[PDB]
Structures are given as structure tokens and as C-alpha cells.
Amino acid sequence: IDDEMFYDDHLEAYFEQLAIPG
Amino acid sequence: TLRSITSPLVAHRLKPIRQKTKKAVVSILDSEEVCVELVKEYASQEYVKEVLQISSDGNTITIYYPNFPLADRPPSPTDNISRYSFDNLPEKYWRKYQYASRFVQLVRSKSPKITYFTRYAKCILMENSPGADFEVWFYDGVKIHKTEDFIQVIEKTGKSYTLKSESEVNSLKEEIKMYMDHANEGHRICLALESIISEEERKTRSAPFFPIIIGRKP
Amino acid sequence: MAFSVLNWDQVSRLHEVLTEVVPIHGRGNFPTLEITLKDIVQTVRSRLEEAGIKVHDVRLNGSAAGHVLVKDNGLGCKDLDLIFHVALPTEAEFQLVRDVVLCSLLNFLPEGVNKLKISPVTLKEAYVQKLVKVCTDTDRWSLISLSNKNGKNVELKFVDSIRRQFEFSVDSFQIILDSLLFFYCSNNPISEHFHPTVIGESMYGDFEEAFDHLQNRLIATKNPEEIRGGGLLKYSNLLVRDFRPTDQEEIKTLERYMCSRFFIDFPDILEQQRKLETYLQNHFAEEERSKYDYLMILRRVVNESTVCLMGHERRQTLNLISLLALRVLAE
């Protein structure tokens, strides 16, 4: 598995939500 | 030993998230345990061969093999279950564990722990301790970002650029030195606050003391 | 931990357990094995010693010990748990122990005994029902289960070290079997004037106190710190079998402790439902009348001992219990 990339856009929605209370 | 190559993961305070990828599904549940689903294709649907449930201090690892079809949530465990402790885990599971570790690590580096508002900037200490990422979002638009390695800067114009080593630190436009001075003041402050609040938590015995917001934009 | 000695009545009942012919179901087309505890224990111990793994002890755990110590008690006979005190350092030995156990499974068959090729995987997927490997800080043991149906489930557990699974007084009993397997060497059977000395043990405290608790039907524990999720469910089973707390004062506190640790360990109601449906299908497969009484004992305990601040989650679980009742009250 040690080739996998997992940094796609649903995670971007997650990050947006993280910074929203700011 | 695995401990000589990476540190044990920490899932405390991390928001739940179900992230699909090409060869796997990773999920941070509400219980803060971390689940990794192995996905294999048959016929025209995808199944889950094994499940890796990792404790919040990743010290206890439960791993099971049910047969289950992929779903909106991780499969429930059967009875064919294996329970291991971190230091007796066999090499066969290390690569997967390092996958979850690097994932958790990346989430931590973007999950705020202390937000701090100054007269000039919104600082954000992330959770990826120690040497946690540290973002300084100046109100006028200038961006600063400090990692244990690189330090990214942006200017209003958008001249996005990066720096290596302490060779160029002193020799720079003293305006950017002003930005870095305020950001290092903020970094020392935020680390002090983290340390003292943590110590009181060490004494304390209840609900978490982080995340934490400090100040306000005027 | 104390040490006691089964009288002749008790030694006889132990002998009956060890010579009882137990049927083992075969998932699929595989025939039912007509095994015996003495035989399995012997074969497993012999091949473990031959394979280079010392077996220090062989003990009988579960409700079987309690049925031996007190004839036709309230606890039934569905459980037949064996413990082989065996050293388990590397995973290599754990894998050998699995191969040895599956091989000794192959040894009991009525005709196809010559099938010296039937492999350990088809045997796992045909005869094994529950498999559990544990190798942690303190805990270190392996567990293989046999089929659960019209017979009784035989569970073989190989303990290197165990965090002293402490429980209620009534299931903390272990009987050291060595004396009775060795004793047959005699050419004649065991009689009243001629029996072996058998030794019982208690995994926490005075053995005579647990025995008293078992004769007078008392409920008691002394390590509540180390209690996990299923204690409450076990406690309600004791309740449905007319056992009473050792002192009505402290049991309201024990109840609160079990409830809090239950909510901490099963927060998701879906996980609760799975846990309960499988508990019910394990302990009350056919005791239909017992199921409703059990569900209402649980509901009573949850209602009285759930702290006020968790009333919301209380109602959700009370509702799950209620829905299970509407089903147990029609079929």
C-alpha cells in the first residue's frame, strides 16, 4: 500500500470545516 | 523494532472522517479509534478483506477478518479477531500501520489546537506536536507558515515562495523580518500556553481543555 | 489464591464431566465428531510435549466447575472451557499451537481417520467457530472454540499470562486436572474407598469464601477497577437466576460502576444492539420464558443505576430493550 495517495477533495471539505469556526 | 522507525499514533481530539482512497478506506470514527478497511474487487462489487481498528493511543490494535461488502461505515467485528500490543505487532502489519500513522499525522498538521488573535494577525497552532505546524495569517493578506523544516511565505501580490535554511534568515527585507518577529513572538506564546494548560490538565480529571480560541478581530 | 480438595461426590462428578461423550457439530457436510474431554486433553497434551512445548497445567474452567462443586445448580452446562498453562513467547509458537490443535481435531473421526491430507484451512472453516489471539503487555493467550448447537461448546484456551480474569465468585473456579488424567495408572475404575486427590483453586482470594458464596447463592466481586463492558450483562443473568448481592448497600455502587463502564464501552446504539442480540442468542437460545424476565431485569437495572446526566442515552437503550421485549413476547 505504501504507494497510496489520499489527499483529495472530500478531505478539502473536511479542512474547510476545520477552519470555519475561525 | 517498529518503535525505532516511527512513533505510535495519537488519535485524541481528532474530528471523525471517512476518506476513500484507490486501494483503501480510512476512517476516524466518533469513538476516536482509527479503522483501516482493505478493499478488493470481485465481479462488480468491492469487499473488505481485513479491518485494522487502532486504539486512540494506538497501543492496543484489534484486527479482524470477517468473511463484507463496502458500506457507509466500517464492518462490525466477528469473533475471528486478533488483539495485539504495539511492540509485538508482526512486520506483516507494519506497512499498514505506517499508512494510518502518516494519515493521522497529516490530519493533525491541519487540525487547529490553539487559535490566537493579535492586533495584526490570526495565529493557528496545529495539533501535530512536537514541532507543530504554525500558521500566521496577517490581516493585511500576508501569509506565514512554519514547519520543523520549511517556512512558507506569501505576499499580497501572490509572490508565493519558500525558504530552506538559516543562511538567509538575517539578510532579508526588514519588513519580512517584522513579520517573522511577530510570528516568533506568537510561537513562543502559544507553546507556553499549551504547556501550562497541559500541566493543569495533567492535574485536572475531566472534559478536554483543547481546542482553544484566544482574542478577537477588532 | 487458596487450595481445596474435591470430596468423593465431587471427584465423581468431575469424572462424569471428563468421560461425558460430547458431540461436536461440523459446519457443512462434515460429520459430527463424538469426542470426549479426556481424549482431547490427552491428545493435545501429548502432541504439545512431543512438539517441544511444555504443558505445566491442565484446568477446567467455566460453569462446568460450578456444576461439579454444586450438583444441578442454576447455571446449566452449556460451557466447557479448558485452560492449558503453556508458555507462548514468539508468534511461531502461536502458529504451532494452532497447527497442533487443528491436527488433534483431525484425530477424532469414526471412519475417515486415514484422511491424512485434509488441510488445516478446511478444518478451520468447518469445525472452528470462534478464534481469539491475544499477545499484549500483560495478557498473552490463545483461544479456539468448538461448535455451538444441539450439544455444548468446548473452548480450549492457552494462557501464558493473563490479567487475572476476575469475575463473580461463582465463575472464578479452576480445577487442576493432572491428578485425574494420571490416575488412569490403575487397572480398575475409581470407587469411593479409592479415589485420587483432586485440587481446586480460586483465581482471586479465599477459595472457601467463593464456595460459600456458591452454596448460599451470593453475588460478589473485588476488582471493579478492571471491570469491562459485559459485567452488567453477566450481572443481569445472575439476577434472572435468583442470586442476590452479598450486601444491599454496596450493590447500588457496583451497579452504578457497571452502568458507567457499559456506556463508556458501547456508546453507539447499533453496537449495543449487536452486542445484545448476540448475548441473547448465546445465553438464551431456547429459554424463551427466561428472555423476557432477563430483558426486564436489565431494564430495571439500567433505569435505577444510570446517572441522571445520561438520561437521554438511557431512553434510547430502554427503547432498544423495549423493542426486544415486543419480539420476545410474541415468539
Question: What distance in Å separates residue C124's CA from the closest CA in chain B?
Answer: 11
Burial of C116 (0-12, 13-18, 19+ CB in 10 A): exposed
- Domain boundaries, given as residue ranges, for chain B: 1-111, 112-218
Contacts B84 to C, Cβ<8 Å: 133, 135-136
Architecture of domain B1-111: 2-Layer Sandwich (3.30)
Q: Is there a common fold for B1-111 and B112-218?
A: yes
Helical (H) or strand (E) element with C144: strand C140-146
Q: Which of B29, B30, B60, B85 best tests the C interface by mutation, with the highest count of C CBs <10 A?
A: B85
Residue B178 C-alpha cell reads as: 517584522
Q: Find, among B127, B155, B156, the residue nearest to B9 by Cα.
A: B127
- Domain boundaries, given as residue ranges, for chain C: 3-219, 220-331
Q: Find, among B81, B31, B19, B18, the residue nearest to B52 by Cα.
A: B81
Residue A15 C-alpha cell reads as: 479542512
Technique used by the depositors: X-ray
Q: Find, among B3, B7, B1, the residue nearest to B128 by Cα.
A: B7
Residue C111 C-alpha cell reads as: 471412519
Residue C314, classed as helix, strand or coil, is helix
Backbone angles phi, psi at C86, to 5 degrees: -135, 135
Find the radius of gyration of the CA atoms of chain C: 21
Q: Cβ neighbours of residue B22 under 8 Å, at least 6 residues apart?
A: A4, A5
Question: Which residue in chain B has the smallest CA separation from C138?
Answer: B85
Residue C12, classed as helix, strand or coil, is helix
Residue B162 C-alpha cell reads as: 519558500
- Out of C130, C136, C271, the one facing B85 most closely (by C-beta) is C136
Distance CA C322, CA C326 (A): 6
Burial of B178 (0-12, 13-18, 19+ CB in 10 A): exposed
Burial of C33 (0-12, 13-18, 19+ CB in 10 A): buried
Looking at the DSSP assignment, which residues form a beta bridge with residue B213? B115
Backbone angles phi, psi at B38, to 5 degrees: -85, 125
What is the DSSP code string of C218-286? Answer: EE--S-GGG--TTHHHHHHHHHHTT-EES-TTTHHHHHHHHHHHHHHH--SHHHHHHHHHHHHHHH-SS
Question: Which residue in chain A has the smallest CA separation from B93?
Answer: A1
Residue B99 sits at the vertex; the CA angle it makes with B94 and B100, to the nearest 5 degrees, is: 100
Contacts B79 to C, Cβ<8 Å: 129-132, 145
Beta strand pairing status for B24-28 and B17-20?
antiparallel
Backbone angles phi, psi at C322, to 5 degrees: -60, -45
Instruction: Judge: C91–B90 Cβ closer than 8 Å, yes or no.
Output: yes
Q: Find, among C239, C170, C300, C268, the residue nearest to B73 by Cα.
A: C268
Question: Which residue in chain B has the smallest CA separation from A19?
Answer: B112
Distance CA C86, CA C51 (A): 13
Q: Find, among C97, C102, C96, the residue nearest to C120 by Cα.
A: C102
Question: Which residue in chain B has the smallest CA separation from A15?
Answer: B110
C131 CB near a chain B CB, below 8 Å? yes
Secondary structure of B171-184 in HEC code, one letter for each residue: CCCHHHHHHHHHHH
Distance CA B87, CA B8 (A): 10
Q: Find, among C43, C25, C35, the residue nearest to C126 by Cα.
A: C25
Give the single-character DSSP code of C151. Answer: S
Secondary structure of chain B in HEC code, one letter for each residue: CHHHCCCCCCCCCCCCEEEECCCEEEEECCCCCEEEEEEEEECCEEEEEEEEEECCCCCEEEEECCCCECCCCCCCCCCCEEEEEHHHCCHHHHHHHHHHHHHHHHHHCCCEEEEEECCCEEEEEECCCCCCCEEEEECCCCEEEECCCCEEEECCCCCCEEECCHHHCCCCCHHHHHHHHHHHHHHHHHHHHHHHHHHHHHHCCCCCCCCEEECCCC
Give the single-character DSSP code of C200. Answer: E
- Out of C91, C133, C145, the one facing B83 most closely (by C-beta) is C133
Q: Find, among C54, C46, C131, C42, the residue nearest to C88 by Cα.
A: C54
Distance CA C4, CA C35 (A): 29
Cβ atoms of residues C81 and C40 within 8 Å = no
Cβ atoms of residues C154 and C82 within 8 Å = yes
Measure CA C107 to chain center: 24
Contacts B22 to A, Cβ<8 Å: 4-5
Distance CA B209, CA B193 (A): 11
Q: What are the CA-CA distances from residue B166 to residues B152, B171, B176, B178, B189 (Å)? A: 14, 10, 15, 16, 22
Give the single-character DSSP code of C216. Answer: T
Looking at the DSSP assignment, which residues form a beta bridge with residue C140? C135, C161
What is the DSSP code string of C156-186? Answer: EEEEEE-------GGG-EEEE-HHHHHT---
Distance CA C275, CA C197 (A): 42
Question: Which residue in chain A has the smallest CA separation from B214?
Answer: A22
Q: Cβ neighbours of residue B75 under 8 Å, at least 6 residues apart?
A: B37, B48, B51, B66, B68
Cβ atoms of residues B108 and B207 within 8 Å = no
Measure CA B19 to chain center: 14
Residue B165 C-alpha cell reads as: 535554511
Q: Give the other-Cβ count within 10 Å of B149's Cβ.
A: 8
What is the DSSP code string of C14-66? Answer: HHHHHH-EEEE--SSSPPPEEEEHHHHHHHHHHHHHHTT--EEEEEE-HHHHH
Instruction: Judge: B79–C132 Cβ closer than 8 Å, yes or no.
Output: yes
Distance in angstroms between the alpha carbons of the first and the last residue of chain C = 45
Distance CA B82, CA C132 (A): 6
Helical (H) or strand (E) element with C4: strand C3-5
Residue A7, classed as helix, strand or coil, is coil
Q: Cβ neighbours of residue C59 under 8 Å, at least 6 residues apart?
A: C82, C83, C85, C174, C175, C176, C177, C201
- Out of C130, C137, C267, the one facing B79 most closely (by C-beta) is C130
Q: Which of B54, B68, B88, B94 best tests the C interface by mutation, with the highest count of C CBs <10 A?
A: B88
Distance CA B123, CA C256 (A): 44
For residue B130, cis peptide bond before it (omega within 30 degrees of 0): yes
Instruction: Judge: B95–A21 Cβ closer than 8 Å, yes or no.
Output: no
Q: Find, among B112, B106, B117, the residue nearest to B127 by Cα.
A: B112
| CATH number for the domain whose boundaries are B112-218 | 3.30.1120.130
Distance CA C98, CA C251 (A): 42
C near A: at least 3 beta-carbon pairs less than 8 Å apart:
no
Instruction: Judge: B31–C267 Cβ closer than 8 Å, yes or no.
Output: yes
Helical (H) or strand (E) element with C297: helix C288-305
Instruction: Judge: B99–A21 Cβ closer than 8 Å, yes or no.
Output: no
Residue C176 C-alpha cell reads as: 487442576
Handedness of CA C42, C47, C53, C54 (dihedral sign): positive
